[PDB]
């Protein structure tokens, strides 16, 4: 269950730039060859997302504000998935997302989050297929409340937007193949919508869940031999903002306009032209 | 983690023996304690397992139906009680840890810390 | 389940000390090896087939490929005479070998 690291290095952050990255589908409609303006909580364009790149580093509990654009350029699939709520502790309801190789779960709970919650991950006979996976994320889960099991979402930018609105847990994904290190691409890429969650609770603070692997062992002391935690990936925060969204022929929206980002957006928006 | 046992003693033929192991303060949050035992002049021999934080015990078949193996989050003391003694039961009974509760991992780890044994022998 | 082991292996000091355990598809299953001295508790030496805990000084090496997982102790010093114990995981539940007692000439 839960390992106590001690003497955890804070995780370096640097401030990149958002570019026009985290437009996701406002609506499940279909709409061609225009374009729509709509008002909701979107990451603004040029924005500074904070890049969280990287022993023992440490996990760090995030604000969740009005919803989490969440990308990660990783190969080593270190991150596995997400916890969301208020005190992470028994005292309130908390959201898991939990990924592997073959489903992800949703649980809301009343989870006793462990402090630096992760998933030890064991391959067996160094067999990469099998991958087994144990939970050391929450020490007692009672009173759980919601529960959803399907596909997993989880050199490829993987985007994800998490919102919690109207009593709905809404996560939007997108997957693109890109050729950059250093920072986000550039270009339009519209997140699809992945699940609304009925779960109607209150989300303030959010944390990444890791993967370590056990690399050597100490009898006696468990917090030994994990790997270190090495987890790159890029947080912003949304805000109310009103887009102008380019439907084409085949319903993809291709390009938007933030329409508060500056004079010739604002004119663009009020035009309703690019 | 630092696993303590009671005292070697002596109990009668058909007699109840009532084993603990007395663990570390934070080992129960994230161990299983097996049950070893040792004959003397054989090899060793797993007894049984418990996870006390999803409190589960688990028995091997030969023990299946005489042994009971129950825990104790306050004092943190695993125990292992053991009914129906026969002469064959003289044993030193370890109690091992591992570091995982899910059972299915207990394959990747080893029993790495060990009680220092406690010799069960019978007398009529 | 079952695990065979040899009772004992003798060596000389500063040898290459080899201890089998056989078992049926033990190389398709992890396998620990355990040491005890005399009057002693049981000492981790190797899991996973392959891998020391820390502490356990580095001349101890084990492999598991077929039927066999064989424990190997390269330069055996004075402190290595103990019993070694072969235990593997089955329908989980662990299982111990017969332990061979390796012993140092003198």
């Known amino acids: 269950q839960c390992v106590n690291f001690t003497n955890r290095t804070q995780l370096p952050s640097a401030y990149t730039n958002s570019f026009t990255r985290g437009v996701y589908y406002p609506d499940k409609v279909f709409r061609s060859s225009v374009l729509h303006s709509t008002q909701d909580l979107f990451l603004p364009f040029f924005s500074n997302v904070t890049w969280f790149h990287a022993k023992r580093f440490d996990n760090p509990v995030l604000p969740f504000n009005d919803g989490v654009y969440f990308a990660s350029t990783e190969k080593s699939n270190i991150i596995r998935g997400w916890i969301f709520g208020t005190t992470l502790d028994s005292k309130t309801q908390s959201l898991l997302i939990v990924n592997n190789a073959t489903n992800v779960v949703i649980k809301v709970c009343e989870f006793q989050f462990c402090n630096y919650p992760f998933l030890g991950v064991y391959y067996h006979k160094n067999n990469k297929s099998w991958m087994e996976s144990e939970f050391r994320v929450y020490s007692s889960a009672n009173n759980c409340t919601f529960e959803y099991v399907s596909q997993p979402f989880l050199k490829n930018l993987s985007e994800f937007v998490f919102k919690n609105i109207d009593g709905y847990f809404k996560i939007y994904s997108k997957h693109t193949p890109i050729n950059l290190v250093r920072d986000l691409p550039q270009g339009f890429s519209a997140l699809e919508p992945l699940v609304d969650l009925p779960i109607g609770i209150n989300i303030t603070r959010f944390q990444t869940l890791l993967a370590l692997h056990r690399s050597y062992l100490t009898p006696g002391d468990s917090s030994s031999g994990w790997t270190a935690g090495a987890a790159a990936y890029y947080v912003g925060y949304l805000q109310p903002r009103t887009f102008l969204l380019k439907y084409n022929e085949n319903g993809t929206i291709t390009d938007a306009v933030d329409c508060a980002l500056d004079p010739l957006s604002e004119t663009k928006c009020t035009l309703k032209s690019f | 983690v630092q696993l303590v046992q009671s005292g070697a003693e002596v109990k009668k033929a058909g007699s109840s023996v009532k084993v603990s192991c007395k663990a570390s303060?934070?080992?129960?949050?994230?161990?299983?304690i097996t049950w070893v035992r040792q004959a003397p002049g054989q090899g060793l021999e797993w007894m049984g397992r418990?996870?006390?934080?999803?409190?589960?015990?688990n028995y091997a078949q030969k023990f299946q139906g005489r042994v009971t193996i129950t825990a104790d989050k306050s004092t943190s003391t695993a125990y292992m009680e053991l009914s129906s003694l026969r002469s064959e039961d003289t044993a030193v009974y370890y109690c091992?840890?591992?570091?995982?509760?899910?059972?299915?991992?207990?394959?990747?780890?080893?029993?790495?810390?060990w009680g220092q044994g406690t010799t069960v022998t019978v007398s009529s | 389940y079952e695990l065979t082991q040899p009772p004992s292996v003798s060596v000389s000091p500063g040898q290459t000390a080899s201890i089998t355990c056989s078992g049926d598809?033990?190389?398709?299953?992890?396998a620990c090896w355990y040491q005890q001295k005399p009057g002693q508790s049981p000492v981790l030496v190797i899991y996973?087939?392959?891998k020391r805990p820390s502490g356990i000084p580095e001349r101890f090496s084990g492999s598991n490929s077929g039927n066999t997982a064989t424990l190997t102790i390269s330069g055996t010093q004075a402190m290595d005479e103990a019993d070694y114990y072969c235990?593997?995981?089955?329908?989980?539940?662990?299982?111990f070998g017969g332990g061979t007692k390796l012993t140092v000439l003198g």
């Open positions: 996973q087939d392959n």
């Open positions: 235990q593997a995981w089955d329908s989980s539940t662990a299982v």
């Open positions: 598809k033990l190389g398709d299953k992890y």
């Open positions: 418990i996870i006390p934080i999803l409190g589960i015990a």
């Open positions: 303060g934070g080992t129960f949050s994230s161990h299983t």
């Open positions: 091992a840890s591992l570091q995982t509760v899910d059972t299915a991992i207990e394959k990747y780890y080893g029993m790495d810390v």
